[PDB]
Structure formats: structure tokens, C-alpha cells
Design a protein. Structure first.
Length: 535
């Protein structure tokens, strides 16, 4: 029998049995349903597919109270085009136009006529390049004309053939070295590297690249706005050249941040609308990003703001190709849900924001009985040769390519460090498939002692904690409401910060739903416990 708890401030909690009381930085507090449950904090219903919408409707009136419109397929976007109560994620005819999904060249825009003049994946009714095949449907400047159609693909009003950065906008067209490649998109804005050689594919060309990075934050010294402090996120509030992590007045208003109250907005006076410790222009907006602290994913970082994965770099881990099918990625739920539909070569979707200390949670689900291969997530991504990966494989299996070596994979969660000395290729590939260490490639920092694969159409919630400063790594897995695997504190210092993403390898129809990341440098307690308990 469980009883009513008190909030973190000691006031009596008034949350649901299956909700926690959290207090925000302004000493207000709110309830959140615990993993396996959904609603506001006060009403919690069971959440079967771990996606934030409950199996039954609830009496409160916020999105998360209305009944999940795909009870078992995770769909945090809750998308329902034809608004018929069946979610796109599990409605036989998503747009209700007669043509069932599998046979509909435009599954979400209605088009019984099924016209498709170029014969690419997409019907005319929803193809941003009518007479030009282009299944990936890239529209870099969000204009309507896909790239394959666009005479100004990046929308900077400079024509493509007359644009020295034909894809990265730059109306000033500055090329500060004449290599022909414009500053806005030259991997080397200082040195002529017309050929653009980038041997390691870290996106620093050769005439630039030093491969010197002493703090391990994934930034070249030559190019690290704060060389000795791991600061992968690279913030520099004032723009004064030196990043916050070493800078002594990150905003510049004369007050040292050693003793300042609006550390990130100019406030030379330390003046207030109230006496409470915080200042003024930064009251409930520490970083004045005009996004209130409570909702701000990186409450003291001006450019990051909201968990958002729709801007993502795509990495391919065996570029030669074995299947020569590339994973293909769909984002949904406003950048808070990723989906991968192919039975593909290895690959990573990786978001553009980087982090120091970070918390990252998602729901892993493989929406299909078919295959039994690998899915996972990525944190501390620095480049295609340096990152941390968590992968899981349904079925024990020896990889079919016996070259370059025999890679055998086991069921059951793996934590791996990837520091490849070769990069995307044959080696890294078998290295990633193999459950164990590969001499110049991968180290298996942790594996789940259960040795249990993921179940077909089942939904698991993951919670990562990374603290690059102290090399702290810790991952938890929940199946339904119950915790099922815990790595414990894994100390490892290979990439001291990086970017977040997802990984897949040979597995069609994975959903990563209800994705959340946030800034967190406050180091977990059981770190010093771990450190002390060397007795
Ligand atoms: C950023 O990271 C910080 C550390 O990793 C996070 O701070 C931690 O916040 C939690 C608050 O939940 C504190 O942990 C404990 O909370 C429990 C809650 O009771 C329930 O859980 C316990 C197991 O702890 C279980 O036994 C019970 O049955 C309950 O179901 C309390 O019982 C404890 O007193 C304890 O406070 C950590 O102490 C706190 N650590 C630190 C170092 O601050 C922080 O919240 C993260 N911030 C984010 C995501 O914004
Ligand atoms: Ca009470
Ligand atoms: Ca649900
Ligand atoms: Ca659902
Ligand atoms: Ca529908
Ligand atoms: Ca329908
Ligand atoms: Ca249809
Ligand atoms: Ca249609
Ligand atoms: Ca077409
Ligand atoms: Ca087309
Ligand atoms: Ca375009
Ligand atoms: Ca252009
Ligand atoms: Ca355009
Ligand atoms: Ca351009
Ligand atoms: Ca240049
Ligand atoms: Ca150059
Ligand atoms: Ca390079
Ligand atoms: Ca490099
Ligand atoms: Ca560095
Ligand atoms: Ca640094
Ligand atoms: Ca600065
Ligand atoms: Ca500072
Ligand atoms: Ca400064
Ligand atoms: Ca200051
Ligand atoms: Ca200030
Ligand atoms: Ca104040
Ligand atoms: Ca803010
Ligand atoms: Ca922010
Ligand atoms: Ca299967
Ligand atoms: Ca297989
Ligand atoms: Ca496969």
C-alpha cells in the first residue's frame, strides 16, 4: 500500500497516485505522470504505448487528457488528417480517399485520381517536384519547389549557378579566400581548398584539420571557442569570442559572473522589480530567449529552446553500401518523434544541437513483426567516427558478411563507445554489429545481463544521463511502468560532449516517439557514491 507523499518543498503533494511532484526553478510546482501513465499530473491514465496519450480519455482538458487515437502504436503527434478519430499511425486509410495506405501514392493528401507524372515515390497531389523524380522530397528553403526544381534552392534570391553556396543562403556572397567556395558554407573559410578534401569527414577540410582537441569536447583547438574547457555546445552569450565556459562576464555588462544575478543579460546595476535573487530582463527568462524558464529545454542558452529534431544531419555508417538502401527518416510531432521505414544499411539521424551535461529520454518501439535487427540512440556525437551509441537487437545473429571479420550480435541492451580510426566503412560496420570490442573501432562499455531482445510491436522508454565533465554515463530502460535494465554509473571519457540522435541498422519500421532532451550539468548523486565506494 502506497501513501500520499510531500512535494520537494515539503508542502503536501496533491498529485495522482501515478504522478510525481516536481518543483520548478521559480519554486512553483507541477505534477507529471510517471512512466507508463499519461494526463496532467492530477489525472493519470495508463499509457500502453508509452507515447504520452492515455488509453482512455480523462476529464481534465489538455491535450494529454484526450484518448490516444492509436492505442498501441506510439504516435505522440497524434496526427489524424481526415479527422475521423483514427490516428494516421494506424488508420488503414489515413486520408480517407479510398486508396488504402499501401496502394496510395499520396497516403496523406487525398487523390483518388492517383496521378504521378514522373513516377517517383510520390503522386502528383503531394510531390514538390511534379515532373522530376525525387523521393527524398528535399525543399531546403521551405518554399514549395523541392530542390530538384528550385532555381534558388536555399531561397537567398541569388540564382544557383550564380551562388557560391548554392544551398546555404548568403546574399553577401563573401568568399574570404577566393577558393570559389563561399564563406557561409566552406569547410575552410581561411585557406583555399577548392577540392574540399576532408579525409576524416569531421567537416574540417585537410588544410584546416589538426586533429588536436585537448578537452575532448569534439572541437579542434584552432576552432574551439574555449580550448581547455569541454564545452561542446560552444555558447558565447556576448559574442566576445570566448565561450561562456571560461569567460568571466559571459554577457559583458561589467559584472563578473562570479558574482552576478542576471548572468546572461546586461544588468550593470543589479537592480530589481523585487528582491528575490534573480534580476530583471531575465526574471522568468534567465537567458531572455523569450521562452519562459519552465518550458525552456536549455533555460540558460539563448539559441536552444525546445526539444526539436526536424533539423537533422544524416550519417551513413557503411557508405559503400551492402543493402544499398539508405535508412529513410521521417520526423513527426513537431520534431519530437522520429520514424525510420527501411530495412537499411547502418545510419544515424542526428540533431543539430550539441550539449554538455544532458538528459535525453525517448520511447523505442518497433512497429512490426518482421526482421529482428538493431535499433538505438546516439549521444555525444562529435563526428562519424566519434560518438556513443545504445543499440538493441531482437534476435541473436552472426552478421552475413564474414569480411572484414566475424561479427556476432547478441540480444539485450548494449552501451558502446565508438572511436573509429577508419570512419564509416566495412570496419565500423562489423564493429557496430558485433557485441564486444573491436580493436580500433568500438568498446562495449555496458550490456544488459538479462541478454533479452526487444519484443515485436512492444514499447520501451529510455532515460540517458550524460555528464561529460566527469565522464558520467547512466541509462535506464523501462518496459511499461517497470524498470528493466539499468547500466548504473558507467564512467567513460571518450567524447566529452556532443550531439543527440538515433541509430538504426537493418531494421524496418522503428518509432522513436515522445522524444525529450534537456540541459543538465548538475551531476547525479550516485557519482560521488560510486567514487567513494571504492572501499
Ligand atoms: C538534473 O539532474 C539531477 C541529478 O541527476 C536531478 O536532481 C535529482 O532530483 C531528484 C528528484 O526526483 C532527487 O532524487 C530523489 O528523489 C526521491 C523521490 O522519491 C522517489 O524515488 C525514490 C528513489 O530516489 C524512491 O525510493 C521513492 O519510493 C520515490 O518514488 C527522494 O526520495 C530523494 O530524497 C531524492 O531527493 C535527487 O536527489 C536530485 N539529485 C541532485 C544531485 O540534485 C535533477 O532533478 C535533474 N534536473 C532536471 C531534469 O531538470
Ligand atoms: Ca492530501
Ligand atoms: Ca499512448
Ligand atoms: Ca498511440
Ligand atoms: Ca485518420
Ligand atoms: Ca480513415
Ligand atoms: Ca488514401
Ligand atoms: Ca491519397
Ligand atoms: Ca511524382
Ligand atoms: Ca517528383
Ligand atoms: Ca526549395
Ligand atoms: Ca541561392
Ligand atoms: Ca526558392
Ligand atoms: Ca547560397
Ligand atoms: Ca572560401
Ligand atoms: Ca576555403
Ligand atoms: Ca577533415
Ligand atoms: Ca578531425
Ligand atoms: Ca576542444
Ligand atoms: Ca572547449
Ligand atoms: Ca563570451
Ligand atoms: Ca563563465
Ligand atoms: Ca565577456
Ligand atoms: Ca555580468
Ligand atoms: Ca548581467
Ligand atoms: Ca528579482
Ligand atoms: Ca528561457
Ligand atoms: Ca534557452
Ligand atoms: Ca521480429
Ligand atoms: Ca536479421
Ligand atoms: Ca534486416
Amino acid at each position: 500500500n502506497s501513501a500520499q507523499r510531500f512535494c520537494p518543498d515539503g508542502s503536501p503533494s496533491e498529485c495522482h497516485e501515478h504522478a510525481d511532484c516536481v518543483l520548478e526553478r521559480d519554486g512553483s510546482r507541477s505534477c507529471v505522470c510517471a512512466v507508463g501513465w499519461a494526463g496532467n499530473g492530477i489525472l493519470c491514465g495508463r499509457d500502453t504505448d508509452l507515447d504520452g496519450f492515455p488509453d482512455e480519455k480523462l476529464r481534465c482538458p489538455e491535450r494529454q487528457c484526450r484518448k490516444d487515437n492509436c492505442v498501441t502504436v506510439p504516435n505522440s503527434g497524434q496526427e489524424d488528417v481526415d479527422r475521423d478519430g483514427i490516428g494516421d499511425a494506424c488508420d488503414p486509410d489515413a486520408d480517407g480517399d479510398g486508396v488504402p495506405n499501401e496502394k496510395d501514392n499520396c497516403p496523406l493528401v487525398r487523390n483518388p485520381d492517383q496521378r504521378n507524372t514522373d513516377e517517383d515515390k510520390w503522386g502528383d497531389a503531394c510531390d514538390n517536384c511534379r515532373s522530376q523524380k525525387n523521393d527524398d522530397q528535399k525543399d531546403t528553403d521551405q518554399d514549395g519547389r523541392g530542390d530538384a526544381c528550385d532555381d534558388d534552392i536555399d531561397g537567398d534570391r541569388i540564382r544557383n549557378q550564380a551562388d557560391n553556396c548554392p544551398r546555404v543562403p548568403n546574399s553577401d556572397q563573401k568568399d574570404s579566400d577566393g577558393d570559389g567556395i563561399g564563406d557561409a558554407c566552406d569547410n575552410c573559410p581561411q585557406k583555399s581548398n577548392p577540392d574540399q578534401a576532408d579525409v576524416d569527414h569531421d567537416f574540417v577540410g585537410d588544410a584546416c584539420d589538426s586533429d588536436q582537441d585537448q578537452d575532448g569536447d569534439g572541437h579542434q583547438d584552432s576552432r574551439d571557442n574555449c580550448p581547455t574547457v569541454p564545452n561542446s555546445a560552444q555558447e558565447d552569450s556576448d559574442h566576445d569570442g570566448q565561450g561562456d565556459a571560461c569567460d568571466d562576464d559571459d554577457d559583458n555588462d561589467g559584472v563578473p559572473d562570479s558574482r552576478d544575478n542576471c548572468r546572461l543579460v546586461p544588468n550593470p546595476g543589479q537592480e530589481d522589480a523585487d528582491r528575490d535573487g534573480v534580476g530583471d530582463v531575465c526574471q522568468d527568462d534567465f537567458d531572455a530567449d523569450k521562452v519562459v524558464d519552465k518550458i525552456d529545454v536549455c533555460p540558460e542558452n539563448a539559441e536552444v529552446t525546445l526539444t526539436d529534431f526536424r533539423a537533422f544531419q544524416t550519417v551513413v555508417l557503411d557508405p559503400e553500401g551492402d543493402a544499398q538502401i539508405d535508412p529513410n527518416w521521417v520526423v513527426l510531432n513537431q520534431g519530437r518523434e522520429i520514424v525510420q521505414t527501411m530495412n537499411s544499411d547502418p545510419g544515424l539521424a542526428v540533431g543539430y544541437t550539441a550539449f554538455n551535461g544532458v538528459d535525453f529520454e525517448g520511447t523505442f518501439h518497433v512497429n512490426t513483426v518482421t526482421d529482428d535487427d538493431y535499433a538505438g540512440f546516439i549521444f555525444g556525437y562529435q563526428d562519424s567516427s566519434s560518438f556513443y551509441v545504445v543499440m538493441w537487437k531482437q534476435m541473436e545473429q552472426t552478421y552475413w558478411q564474414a569480411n572484414p571479420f566475424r561479427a556476432v550480435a547478441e540480444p539485450g541492451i548494449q552501451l558502446k563507445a565508438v572511436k573509429s580510426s577508419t570512419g564509416p566503412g566495412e570496419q565500423l560496420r562489423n564493429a557496430l554489429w558485433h557485441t564486444g570490442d573491436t580493436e580500433s573501432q568500438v568498446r562495449l562499455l555496458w550490456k544488459d545481463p538479462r541478454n533479452v531482445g526487444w519484443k515485436d510491436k512492444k514499447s520501451y522508454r529510455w532515460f540517458l544521463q550524460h555528464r561529460p565533465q566527469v565522464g558520467y554515463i547512466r541509462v535506464r530502460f523501462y518496459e511499461g511502468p517497470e524498470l528493466v535494465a539499468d547500466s548504473n554509473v558507467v564512467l567513460d571519457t571518450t567524447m566529452r560532449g556532443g550531439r543527440l540522435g538515433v541509430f538504426c541498422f537493418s531494421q524496418e519500421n522503428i518509432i522513436w516517439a515522445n522524444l525529450r532532451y534537456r540541459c543538465n550539468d548538475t551531476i547525479p548523486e550516485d557519482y560521488e557514491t560510486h567514487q567513494l565506494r571504492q572501499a
